[PDB]
PDB file of N, CA and C in Angstrom:
ATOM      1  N   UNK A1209       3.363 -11.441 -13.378  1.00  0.00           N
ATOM      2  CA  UNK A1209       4.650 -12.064 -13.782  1.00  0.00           C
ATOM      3  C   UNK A1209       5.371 -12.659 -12.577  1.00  0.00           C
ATOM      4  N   UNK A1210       4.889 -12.078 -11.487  1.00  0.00           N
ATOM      5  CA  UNK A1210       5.809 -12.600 -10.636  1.00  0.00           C
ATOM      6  C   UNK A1210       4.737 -12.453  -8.994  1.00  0.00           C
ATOM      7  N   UNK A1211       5.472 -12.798  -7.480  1.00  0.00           N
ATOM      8  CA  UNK A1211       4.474 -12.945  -6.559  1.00  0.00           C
ATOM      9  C   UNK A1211       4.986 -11.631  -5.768  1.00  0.00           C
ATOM     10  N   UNK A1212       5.025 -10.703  -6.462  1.00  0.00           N
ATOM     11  CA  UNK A1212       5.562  -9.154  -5.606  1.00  0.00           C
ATOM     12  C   UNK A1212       4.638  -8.527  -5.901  1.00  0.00           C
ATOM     13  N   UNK A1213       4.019  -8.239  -6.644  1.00  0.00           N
ATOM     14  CA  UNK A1213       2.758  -7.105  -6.715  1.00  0.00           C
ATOM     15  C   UNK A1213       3.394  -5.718  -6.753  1.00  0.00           C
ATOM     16  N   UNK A1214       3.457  -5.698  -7.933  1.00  0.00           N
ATOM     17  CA  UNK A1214       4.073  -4.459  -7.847  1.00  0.00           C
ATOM     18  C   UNK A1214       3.115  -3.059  -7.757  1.00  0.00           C
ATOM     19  N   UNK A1215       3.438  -2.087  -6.133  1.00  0.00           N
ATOM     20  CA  UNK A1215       2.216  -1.512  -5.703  1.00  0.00           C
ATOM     21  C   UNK A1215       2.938  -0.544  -4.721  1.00  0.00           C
ATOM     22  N   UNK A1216       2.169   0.741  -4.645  1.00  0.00           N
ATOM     23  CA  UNK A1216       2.659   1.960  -3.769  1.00  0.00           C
ATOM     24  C   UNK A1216       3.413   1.502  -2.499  1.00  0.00           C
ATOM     25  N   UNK A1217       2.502   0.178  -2.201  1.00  0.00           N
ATOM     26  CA  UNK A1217       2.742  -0.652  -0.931  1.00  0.00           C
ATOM     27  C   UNK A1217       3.837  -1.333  -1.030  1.00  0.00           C
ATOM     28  N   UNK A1218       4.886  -0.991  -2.112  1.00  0.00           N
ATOM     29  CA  UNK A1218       5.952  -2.400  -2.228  1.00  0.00           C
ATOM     30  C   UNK A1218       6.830  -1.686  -3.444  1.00  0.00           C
ATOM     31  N   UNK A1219       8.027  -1.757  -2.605  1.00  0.00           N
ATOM     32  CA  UNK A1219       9.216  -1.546  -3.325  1.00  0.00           C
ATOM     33  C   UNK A1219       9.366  -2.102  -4.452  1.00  0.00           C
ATOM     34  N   UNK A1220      10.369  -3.647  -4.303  1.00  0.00           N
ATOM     35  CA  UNK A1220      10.475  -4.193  -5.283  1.00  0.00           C
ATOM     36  C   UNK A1220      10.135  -5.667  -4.912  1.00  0.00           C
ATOM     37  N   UNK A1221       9.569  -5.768  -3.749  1.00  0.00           N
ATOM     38  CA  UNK A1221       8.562  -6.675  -3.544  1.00  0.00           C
ATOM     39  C   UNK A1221       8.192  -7.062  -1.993  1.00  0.00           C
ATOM     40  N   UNK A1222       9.016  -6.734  -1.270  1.00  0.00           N
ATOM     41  CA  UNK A1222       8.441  -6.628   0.454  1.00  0.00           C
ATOM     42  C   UNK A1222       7.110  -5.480   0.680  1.00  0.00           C
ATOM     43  N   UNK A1223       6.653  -5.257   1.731  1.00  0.00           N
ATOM     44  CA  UNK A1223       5.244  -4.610   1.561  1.00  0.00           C
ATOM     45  C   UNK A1223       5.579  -3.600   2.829  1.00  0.00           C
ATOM     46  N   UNK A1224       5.612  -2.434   2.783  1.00  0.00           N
ATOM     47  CA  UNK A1224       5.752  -1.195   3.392  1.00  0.00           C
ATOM     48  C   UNK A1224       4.818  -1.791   4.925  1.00  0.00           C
ATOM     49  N   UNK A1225       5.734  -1.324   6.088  1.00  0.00           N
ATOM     50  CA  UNK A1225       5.640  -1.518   7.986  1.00  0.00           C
ATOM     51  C   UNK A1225       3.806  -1.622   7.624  1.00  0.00           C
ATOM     52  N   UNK A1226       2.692  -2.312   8.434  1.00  0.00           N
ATOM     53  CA  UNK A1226       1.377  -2.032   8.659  1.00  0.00           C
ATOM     54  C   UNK A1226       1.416  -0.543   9.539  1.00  0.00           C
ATOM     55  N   UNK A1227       0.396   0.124   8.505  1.00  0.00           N
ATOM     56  CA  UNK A1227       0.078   1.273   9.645  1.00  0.00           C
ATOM     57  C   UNK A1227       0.988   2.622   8.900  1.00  0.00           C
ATOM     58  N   UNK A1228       1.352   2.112   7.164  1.00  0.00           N
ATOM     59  CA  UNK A1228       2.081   3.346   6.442  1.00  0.00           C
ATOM     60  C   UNK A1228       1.339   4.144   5.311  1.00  0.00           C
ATOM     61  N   UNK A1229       0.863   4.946   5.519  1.00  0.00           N
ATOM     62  CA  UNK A1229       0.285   5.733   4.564  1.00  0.00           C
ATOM     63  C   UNK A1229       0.487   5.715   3.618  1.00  0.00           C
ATOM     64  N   UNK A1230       0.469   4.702   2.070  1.00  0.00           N
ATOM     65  CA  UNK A1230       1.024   4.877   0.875  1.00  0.00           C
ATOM     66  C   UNK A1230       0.968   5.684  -0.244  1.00  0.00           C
ATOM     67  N   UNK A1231      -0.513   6.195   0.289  1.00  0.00           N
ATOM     68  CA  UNK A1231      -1.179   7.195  -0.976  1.00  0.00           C
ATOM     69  C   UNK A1231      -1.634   8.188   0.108  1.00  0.00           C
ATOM     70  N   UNK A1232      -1.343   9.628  -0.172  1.00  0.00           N
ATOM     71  CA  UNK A1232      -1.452  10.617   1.004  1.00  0.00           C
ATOM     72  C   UNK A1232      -2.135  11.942  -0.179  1.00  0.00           C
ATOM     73  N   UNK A1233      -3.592  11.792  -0.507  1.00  0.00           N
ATOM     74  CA  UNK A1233      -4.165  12.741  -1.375  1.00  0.00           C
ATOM     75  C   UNK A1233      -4.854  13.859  -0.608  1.00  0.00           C
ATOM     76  N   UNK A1234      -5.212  14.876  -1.146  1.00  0.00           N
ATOM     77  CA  UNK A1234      -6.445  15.597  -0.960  1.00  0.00           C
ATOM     78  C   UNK A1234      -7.585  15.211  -0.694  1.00  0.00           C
ATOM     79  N   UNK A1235      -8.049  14.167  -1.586  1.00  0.00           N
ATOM     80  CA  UNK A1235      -9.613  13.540  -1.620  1.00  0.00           C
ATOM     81  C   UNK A1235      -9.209  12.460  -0.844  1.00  0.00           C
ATOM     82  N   UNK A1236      -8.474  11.894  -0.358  1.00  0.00           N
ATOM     83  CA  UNK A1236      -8.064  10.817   0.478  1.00  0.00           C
ATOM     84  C   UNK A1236      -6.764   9.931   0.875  1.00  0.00           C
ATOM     85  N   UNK A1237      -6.391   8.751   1.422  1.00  0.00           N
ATOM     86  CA  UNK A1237      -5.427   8.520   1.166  1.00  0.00           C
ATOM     87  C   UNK A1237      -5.359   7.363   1.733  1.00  0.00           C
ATOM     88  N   UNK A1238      -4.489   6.187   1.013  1.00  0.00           N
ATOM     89  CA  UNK A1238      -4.812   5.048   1.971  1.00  0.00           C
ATOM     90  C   UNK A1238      -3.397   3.994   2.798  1.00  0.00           C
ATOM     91  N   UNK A1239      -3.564   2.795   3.235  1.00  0.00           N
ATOM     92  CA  UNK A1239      -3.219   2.718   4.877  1.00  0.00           C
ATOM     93  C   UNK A1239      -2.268   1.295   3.595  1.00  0.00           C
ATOM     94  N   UNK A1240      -1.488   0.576   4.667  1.00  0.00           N
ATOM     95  CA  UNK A1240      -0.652  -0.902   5.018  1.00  0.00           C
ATOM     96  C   UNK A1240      -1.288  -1.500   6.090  1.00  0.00           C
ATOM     97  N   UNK A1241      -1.735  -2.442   5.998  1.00  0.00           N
ATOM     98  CA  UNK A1241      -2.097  -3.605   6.770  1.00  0.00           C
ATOM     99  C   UNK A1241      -1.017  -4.728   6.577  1.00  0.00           C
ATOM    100  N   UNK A1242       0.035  -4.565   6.200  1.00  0.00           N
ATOM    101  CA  UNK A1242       1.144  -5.680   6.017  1.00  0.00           C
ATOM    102  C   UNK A1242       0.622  -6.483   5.548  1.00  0.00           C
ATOM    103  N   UNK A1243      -0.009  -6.591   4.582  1.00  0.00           N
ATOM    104  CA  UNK A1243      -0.396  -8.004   4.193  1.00  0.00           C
ATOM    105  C   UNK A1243      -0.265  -7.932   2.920  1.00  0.00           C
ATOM    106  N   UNK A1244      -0.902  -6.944   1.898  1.00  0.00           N
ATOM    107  CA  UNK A1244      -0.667  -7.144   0.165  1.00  0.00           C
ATOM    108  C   UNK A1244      -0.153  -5.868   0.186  1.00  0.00           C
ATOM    109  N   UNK A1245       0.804  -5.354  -1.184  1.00  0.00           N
ATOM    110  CA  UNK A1245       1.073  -4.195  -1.684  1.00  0.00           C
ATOM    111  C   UNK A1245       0.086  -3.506  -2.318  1.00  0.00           C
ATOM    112  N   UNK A1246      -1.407  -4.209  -2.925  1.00  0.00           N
ATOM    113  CA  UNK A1246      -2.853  -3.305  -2.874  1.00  0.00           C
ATOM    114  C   UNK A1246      -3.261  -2.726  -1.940  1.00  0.00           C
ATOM    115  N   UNK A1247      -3.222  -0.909  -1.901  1.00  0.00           N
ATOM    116  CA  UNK A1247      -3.250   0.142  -0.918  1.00  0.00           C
ATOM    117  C   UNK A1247      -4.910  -0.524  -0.786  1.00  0.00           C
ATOM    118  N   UNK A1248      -5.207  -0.889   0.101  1.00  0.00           N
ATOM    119  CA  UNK A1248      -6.777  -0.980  -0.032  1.00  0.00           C
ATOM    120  C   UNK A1248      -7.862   0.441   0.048  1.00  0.00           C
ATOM    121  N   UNK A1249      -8.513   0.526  -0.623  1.00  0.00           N
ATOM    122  CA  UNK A1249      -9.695   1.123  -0.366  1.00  0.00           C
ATOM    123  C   UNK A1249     -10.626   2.203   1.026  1.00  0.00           C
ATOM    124  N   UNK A1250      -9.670   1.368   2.139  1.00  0.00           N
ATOM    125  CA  UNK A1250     -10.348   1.922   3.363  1.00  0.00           C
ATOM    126  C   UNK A1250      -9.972   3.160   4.355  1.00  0.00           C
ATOM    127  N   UNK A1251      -9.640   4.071   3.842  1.00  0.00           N
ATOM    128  CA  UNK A1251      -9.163   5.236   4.432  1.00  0.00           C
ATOM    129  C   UNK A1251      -9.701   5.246   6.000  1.00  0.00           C
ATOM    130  N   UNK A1252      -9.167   6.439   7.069  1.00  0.00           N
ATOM    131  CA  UNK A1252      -9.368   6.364   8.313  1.00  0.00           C
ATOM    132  C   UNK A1252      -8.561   7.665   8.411  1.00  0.00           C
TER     133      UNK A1252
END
């Protein structure tokens, strides 16, 4: 609907500092690369 992406990574549409933990699980958890509000895939 709109160009915010609405995502762990994003409030109500700016995208959480690169380098913020958005999803912090047991089995894993993933990162901000400042670029999309899709937590990507690549844990570290």
């Amino acid at each position: 609907a709109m160009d915010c992406t609405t995502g762990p990574c994003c409030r109500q549409c700016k995208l959480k500092p690169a380098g913020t933990t958005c999803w912090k699980t047991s089995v894993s958890s993933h990162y901000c690369t400042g670029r999309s509000c899709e937590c990507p895939s690549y844990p570290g």
